[PDB]
Amino acid sequence: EPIPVSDLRVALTGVRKAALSWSNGNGTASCRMLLESIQDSRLQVNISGLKPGVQYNINPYLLQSSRDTEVLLVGLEPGTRYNATVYSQAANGTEGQPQAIEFRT
């Protein structure tokens, strides 16, 4: 069972853009991110296979249709609150405890 992700950060890199990043423990093989909104902007996506050392560019509405990890979220609805919850995952599938962050684009 892996340790939770560390230093979960978000940078508002644009009107419709947000860059998430975090550090992975040494037993972390991959990460799961549950991304939700808080008017077709309603969103609930479960993104799997996020790997340590890899940067991703993701349009979450498309999918809905070192050893850090970076996720650039694009096409977000401006002025909307979003919640990202990241779960670390060991090789066998066991999940660490979640770490969550809320941001408004």
26 secondary structure, DSSP code: T
Distance CA 50, CA 86 (A): 10
Here the contacts of 46-55 (C-beta below 8 Å, separation 24 or greater) are 47/71, 50/86, 52/24, 52/28
- The amino acid present at 94, given as its one-letter code, is T
Distances from the Cα of 95 to the Cα of 5, 20, 32, 79, angstroms? 11, 20, 9, 32
In the chain, what are the domain boundaries? 1-105
User: Is the Cβ–Cβ distance between 55 and 31 less than 8 Å?
Assistant: no
> Residues near 32 by Cβ (< 8 Å), separated by ≥ 6?
46, 47, 48, 50, 86, 87, 89, 95
What resolution (Å)? 2.3
The experimental technique behind this entry is: X-ray
